[PDB]
């Protein structure tokens, strides 16, 4: 059993791949032979030791996995069945998916959606799952294509890439915000009508000119504050991230004078029914071209190279991890 | 034609009751003989000159009125008809309701709902209208009496008083936040289960203990920031005010880790359909005891005094205004 393992000394996190035994895995009524995982921003924070994502060491990181069920004391799952997992504290406070085996509670698993397989499921991963929940939040708020432009921040990343592709597919005019010139052609190829620079979202009045029918935000901080000030009357912002900072120095003005909805989107504890709905929607609404335009396959032990890259804003798209 | 008129010299606002000619009224399709108005927080800002609510003087303030139609060039409205008005820029950049006559666009009016008269309509006013929109926002977010406690800030005020009464009638367990010990009995009599002091809502961590199923906030600033940190997973905050300050020094944490919705509530430009729904619901759900328990009926020339009291956190309930 090969596993990426986090250890802690003198404050710092060390990441290495070690050969563990089956016996070291935590209790959990379903054992899964993991074939694929991925790197999300939260995984990168954990692996580099930034932000105190993980409080208990040693720890196998990886909030995502997909593979084949080895055994099951949960009668909903059987040996041979393709399953996936995102969230539920896995990869944070419970040994995760960046390993050839994981053991988890059956409630945390999702039976493989029809039209999907383990590889494609992990290209999507937590970031794509989260993008879908964000699109669904915009739809719950009555934001339709004809209402105006949708803005996506941190657009070149995982959630952002998925969001641009989903929205373009669903008929929306999408505007991407990126802090790098090198992402422009990639973002246009995903379906973005144009790409605005991040340095134009550094400061804002409480109320800016109305330009967005809706928004999907992955950066928080001053970018989210400006986006809120730019929302159309009745518009909605689906906020899922903190890539630019966890604080939100905003005002009540967009809320109380423009009836703006700021919908928070969490992926960790998404209830079973909405979880299943999001996956079903991804199979239908994410075009097959995405799985080759946005994905980069890496091996397990080179994950820390790419975790550093994520933190350092040197990553584009989705990092798929082949575990075997 | 009696009217509270605001002038401006040396950057200070001067409020007085003057007798004006009919010919000084602005152009409008519908002339209304106003019998009743009210004072909301916004009117108080305008009358005292605090903030920049009013940019063009002279101005008749008053974002609300109710009365009888005098003349009409708009075929939807006839002489003799009972009508009300809240918002639409009236009392801000168009001569308002604290006067014996107003002249307005027919789109801005609401035909008197059945079960309601001009007096009761202004006891409710913008503040009560707003409270109803906030309760409706909580319902849109799936918050039900069984889900847990609803917190109402600035509870002794107009929006707050209406909110507590509406929620108690609808079956919710309500918790009021007030910064004065003198409001406690009043708030209990409206339907509040308990009253927490406002000094316990000053500083907050990004995430506090989950305690609120939903919230209606009239204060903004640091009170709203703490309430956000205290929301249950999937909870909703309807935010409509800035009584404690217009800034919002919060974080993204409640949003991204607890799926919290921050629904902003505006009353100025609420579209016709939603507007009519709120008034219909106010007739259904506001108990008759509210009109006696929260109302204080003043004359036009007492409006500057009551405006000061509002800014200085010295009123309780709703200020109704007998215009004639
Ligand atoms: N709570 C939850 O359940 C979930 C939360 N998330 C959140 O979504 C957010 C993004 O996730 P993911 O796509 O995986 O991360 P990525 O790193 O792949 O993308 C984030 C993007 O943000 C931009 N960015 C990076 N650094 C900064 C910075 N310092 N200031 C401003 N912008 C920056 C970059 O785009 P560019 O170069 O174009 O500016 C980058 O591509 C994360 O904060 C993550 O926590 C995601 C899934 C679930
Ligand atoms: N955008 C829109 O369409 C609408 C906005 N609103 C807003 O709702 C808010 C309240 O309206 P309204 O009820 O009419 O005003 P009120 O003055 O009647 O209510 C405000 C309450 O807030 C509390 N308060 C007052 N000052 C402070 C302070 N400095 N710090 C903390 N709390 C304070 C008081 O309660 P206590 O003493 O118990 O602490 C007071 O009763 C206003 O900001 C108003 O503009 C209302 C309707 C519509």
Swiss-Prot record, chains A, B:
Catalytic activity, per the record?
propanoyl-CoA + NADP(+) = acryloyl-CoA + NADPH + H(+)
| Keywords for this protein | Cytoplasm, NADP, Oxidoreductase
Q: Where does NADP(+) bind?
A: 41, 156-159, 178-180, 198, 242, 256, 267, 313
Does Oxidoreductase count among this protein's keywords?
yes
Gene3D superfamilies per record: Medium-chain alcohol dehydrogenases, catalytic domain, NAD(P)-binding Rossmann-like Domain
Task: Cite the EC number.
Answer: 1.3.1.84
Subcellular location field:
Cytoplasm
MF terms in GO: acryloyl-CoA reductase (NADPH) activity; protein homodimerization activity
Taxonomy, superkingdom:
Bacteria
The annotated phenotype of a deletion mutant is: 100-fold increased sensitivity to acrylate, about 8-fold increased sensitivity to 3-hydroxypropionate. Acrylate is bacteriostatic, not bacteriocidal. Can be complemented by acuI from a number of other bacteria, including Rhodobacter sphaeroides strain 2.4.1 (AC Q3J6K9) and Ruegeria pomeyroi (AC Q5LS56).
**Assembly and oligomerization:** Homodimer.
Q: What does this protein do?
A: Probably catalyzes the NADPH-dependent reduction of acrylyl-CoA to propanoyl-CoA.
Q: What else is known?
A: The zinc-binding residues of the alcohol dehydrogenase family are not conserved.
What does the sequence similarity comment in the record state about its family?
Belongs to the zinc-containing alcohol dehydrogenase family. Acrylyl-CoA reductase subfamily.
Its protein name is Probable acrylyl-CoA reductase AcuI
């Amino acid at each position: 059993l090969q596993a990426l393992l986090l250890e802690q000394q003198d404050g710092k996190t060390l990441a290495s791949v070690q050969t563990l035994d089956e016996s070291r895995l935590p209790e959990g009524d379903v054992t899964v032979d993991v074939h694929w995982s991925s790197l999300n921003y939260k995984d990168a924070l954990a692996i580099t030791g930034k932000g105190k994502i993980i409080r208990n060491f040693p720890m196998i990181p990886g909030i995502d996995f997909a593979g084949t069920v080895r055994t099951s004391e949960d009668p909903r799952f059987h040996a041979g069945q393709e399953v996936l997992l995102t969230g539920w504290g896995v990869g944070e406070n419970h040994w995760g998916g960046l390993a050839e085996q994981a053991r988890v509670k059956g409630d945390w698993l999702v039976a493989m959606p029809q039209g999907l397989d383990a590889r494609k499921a992990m290209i999507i991963g937590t970031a794509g799952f989260t993008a879908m929940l964000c699109v669904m939040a915009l739809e719950d708020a009555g934001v339709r294509p004809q209402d105006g432009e949708i803005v996506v921040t941190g657009a070149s990343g995982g959630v952002g890439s998925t969001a641009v592709a989903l929205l373009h597919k669903l008929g929306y005019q999408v505007v991407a915000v990126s802090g790098r010139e090198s992402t422009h052609e990639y973002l246009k190829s995903l379906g973005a009508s144009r790409v605005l620079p991040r340095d134009e979202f550094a400061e804002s009045r409480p109320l800016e000119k109305q330009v967005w029918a809706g928004a999907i935000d992955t950066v928080g901080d001053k970018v989210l504050a400006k986006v809120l000030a730019q929302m159309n009357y009745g518009g909605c912002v689906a906020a899922c991230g903190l890539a630019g900072g966890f604080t939100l120095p905003t005002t009540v003005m967009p809320f109380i004078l423009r009836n703006v909805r700021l919908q928070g989107v969490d992926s960790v504890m998404t209830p079973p029914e909405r979880r299943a709905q999001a996956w079903q929607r991804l199979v239908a609404d994410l075009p097959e071209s995405f799985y080759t335009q946005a994905a980069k396959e890496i091996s397990l032990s080179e994950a820390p190279n790419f975790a550093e890259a994520i933190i350092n804003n040197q990553i584009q798209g989705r990092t798929l991890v082949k575990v075997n």
